Amino acid sequence: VARGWGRKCPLFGKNKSR
Structure with missing residues (x-):
């Protein structure tokens, strides 16, 4: 999803730990 x-x-969501 x-x-x-x-x-x-x-x-894909590594930005969560930018």
Whole structure:
């Protein structure tokens, strides 16, 4: 889904740990 691309996503949501 397109709801876990922020933090729920590792290499896709790495921005969560910017």
